[PDB]
């Protein structure tokens, strides 16, 4: 009967709530009343890369912290050298409505996706020196939101049909499918060891997934509206989430609940992009009021502002050795800060 | 080996200049409507697991690209932000009474969204002959769904088409008046709505889109001069 199943669900939820409330003894703000504030952090623009014709939606850094890829709503994907502002590659796409990009850890491949429900994989270094389309992966029933590489032969995607998938490239077939969300899946992040990954999915919920098996391990709730960006902490034992309710939060995978909230009484705009720093002390976030904010991740008090853009800030990224921070926005420019 | 790098950068810049010149003179439109409407007929009415369909046409040596949404779910609050820089949104409505309230609500929600407050809408009230036959026959009564049709009279400055019953004129202008009231409720003056009447077999839609796009760009140009 439906009533019995609903009652069992309610009882399980109440047991979960009791066991969860039986674990909050100390708050993060009370154990951290002896931490020196980082002080004001002033950042200056060192470079400005120009060349796009419409709004940018994504960017990924290279493994060497020198080369980067950018994707725009005009059908182009550019590979830049950041030291000298040179252009190393320009690639035209079959579709103009791009929403994601990824750069291979070995530097040999790139990938892209969007509103055509298809993931395209391009080869970089060939004998002729020309960039050619190597693979097209199809099978999703909704628009793709993000994609990340594991190696030269496996990839992971998340789509707007409430699903994620693990793909084999050479054969061209799906290998695993992860299901269980309720709304659109908006972002996924990969662990440093590449065995677990987390997803945020537009119903005020987040989940953690195991790759080799295909099952859900744990889920987290607490936001009031959709979830927009997600990323891991350096040690792989935490992650941070932004939402369309103008709040940021920090979640942990062992205590299995919420730790810290970043918010303000003046901020009434959501959060678009989030990424941590090398040490895990600065949390950088993009907002829909034209500027980026730099948050002390342990004190929940603002520490800096970056205010050089003229439109919505969409994408933001940090290097592999910690040097530069790159931001891209809806005004077709891209800025390097150090 | 800096010289080779600079040479490659210059070649890429030349290519990007050609691409920009081509890109800057193509207009982009977005098509919206309901399943029981006839937007597919309009798509097949215009001549020069896929997630999006594209059609191309050319009028007076100007190139239009139009886009339609295919295999997607029915929640639209995330991929509707990809169309904030298009020239126009084309909204098609089945004006044969009942689901007109859903159409009103959808148009109202499109009109008030933050990322679409600067974008103009071209309104097609399709399904004309069915409306004519339905209202003329009189089996179903419009007064049941909308009580305000119990006092409305045709404005004295109306310009009806020849050979037409006054009843169908009252009906059609009442339905248009509802949409225009929702349109001018805000009263801001930054974007405009354009209503039209269309049927299943017509051959004059490209010209209408053409003329409204010309008016849109004229307003945008006049605002640059601080001259409006």
């Amino acid at each position, epitope marked *: 009967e439906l009533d019995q199943l609903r009652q069992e669900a309610e009882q399980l939820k109440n047991q979960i709530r009791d066991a969860r409330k039986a674990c909050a003894d100390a708050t993060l703000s009370q154990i951290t009343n002896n931490i020196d504030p980082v002080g004001r952090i002033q950042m200056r623009t060192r470079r400005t890369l120009r060349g796009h014709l419409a709004k940018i939606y994504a960017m990924h850094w290279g493994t060497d912290s020198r080369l980067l890829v950018s994707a725009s709503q005009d059908g182009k994907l550019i590979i830049w050298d950041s030291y000298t502002t040179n252009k190393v590659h320009a690639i035209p796409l079959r579709s103009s409505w791009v929403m994601t990009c990824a750069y291979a850890p070995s530097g040999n491949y790139v990938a892209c996706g969007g509103l055509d429900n298809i993931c395209s994989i391009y080869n970089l270094k060939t004998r002729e020196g020309n960039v050619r389309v190597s693979r097209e992966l199809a099978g999703h029933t909704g628009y793709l939101s993000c994609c990340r590489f594991l190696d030269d032969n496996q990839i992971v995607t998340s789509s707007g049909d409430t699903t994620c998938a693990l793909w084999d490239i050479e054969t061209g077939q799906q290998t695993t499918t992860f299901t269980g969300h*309720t*709304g659109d899946v908006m972002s996924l992040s990969l662990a440093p060891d590449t065995r677990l990954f987390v997803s945020g999915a537009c*119903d*005020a919920s987040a989940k953690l997934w195991d790759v080799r098996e295909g099952m859900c391990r744990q889920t987290f*709730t*607490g936001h*009031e*509206s*959709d979830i927009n960006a997600i990323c891991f902490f350096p040690n792989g034992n935490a992650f941070a989430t932004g939402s*369309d*309710d*103008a709040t940021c939060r920090l979640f942990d995978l062992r205590a299995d609940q919420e730790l810290m909230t970043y918010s303000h009484d003046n901020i*009434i705009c*959501g959060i678009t992009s989030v990424s941590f720093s090398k040490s895990g002390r600065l949390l950088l976030a993009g907002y829909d009021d034209f500027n980026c904010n730099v948050w002390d991740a342990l004190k929940a008090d603002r520490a800096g502002v970056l205010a050089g853009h003229d439109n919505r800030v969409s994408c933001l990224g940090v290097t592999d050795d910690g040097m530069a921070v790159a931001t891209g926005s809806w005004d077709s420019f891209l800025k390097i800060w150090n | 080996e800096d010289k080779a790098a600079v040479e490659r950068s210059k070649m890429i810049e030349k290519q990007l200049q050609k691409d920009k010149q081509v890109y800057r003179r193509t207009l982009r439109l977005l098509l919206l409507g309901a399943d029981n409407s006839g937007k597919s007929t309009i798509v097949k009415q215009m001549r020069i697991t896929s997630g999006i369909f594209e059609t191309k046409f050319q009028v007076d040596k100007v190139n239009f690209h139009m886009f339609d949404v295919g295999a997607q*779910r*029915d*929640e*639209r*609050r995330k991929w509707i932000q990809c169309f904030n820089d298009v020239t126009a949104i084309i909204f098609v409505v089945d004006s044969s009474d009942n689901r007109l*309230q*859903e159409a009103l*609500n959808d148009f109202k*929600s499109i009109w*008030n*969204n*933050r990322w679409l407050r600067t974008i103009s809408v071209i309104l097609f009230l399709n399904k004309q002959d069915l409306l004519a036959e339905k209202v003329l026959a009189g089996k179903s009564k419009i007064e049941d*769904y*909308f*009580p*305000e049709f119990a006092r409305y009279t045709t404005p004295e400055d109306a310009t009806p088409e020849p050979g037409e019953d006054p009843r169908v004129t009252r009906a059609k202008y009442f339905i248009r008046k509802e949409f225009v009231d929702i349109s001018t409720a805000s009263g801001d003056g930054r974007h405009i709505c354009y209503p039209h009447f269309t049927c299943s077999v017509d051959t004059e839609n490209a010209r209408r889109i053409f003329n409204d796009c010309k008016d849109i760009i004229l307003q945008m140009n006049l605002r640059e001069y601080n001259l409006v």
Partner: nanobody
Amino acid sequence: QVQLQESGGGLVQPGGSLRLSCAASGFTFSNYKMNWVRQAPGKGLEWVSDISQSGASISYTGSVKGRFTISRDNAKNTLYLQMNSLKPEDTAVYYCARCPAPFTRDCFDVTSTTYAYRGQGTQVTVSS
């Protein structure tokens, strides 16, 4: 964890009267816009009335003009529908609805495919 739960309803003769009251938990109550929805046998999802943040803007569908009244109770976190002088075509299941975002005036909340922040509903039956 967004939660909405309805109360009231039941059986009532034609020309009767009842009061539908709905309670919420898991979010601030004032920043949002709220709506009423009902579903009749052999139909889809409909719409009835809406009320804004302060209660100073109201909107009704034509079929319940002069019949039903909507109320926001901020302090007690409640939404109210007074319903009177009925017809047999009001027999339906009834849900509340919350807008997806705060500090805005737009709604995309009728979807069959499991809109998230929607209630379970109550049954209203009218006969004699």
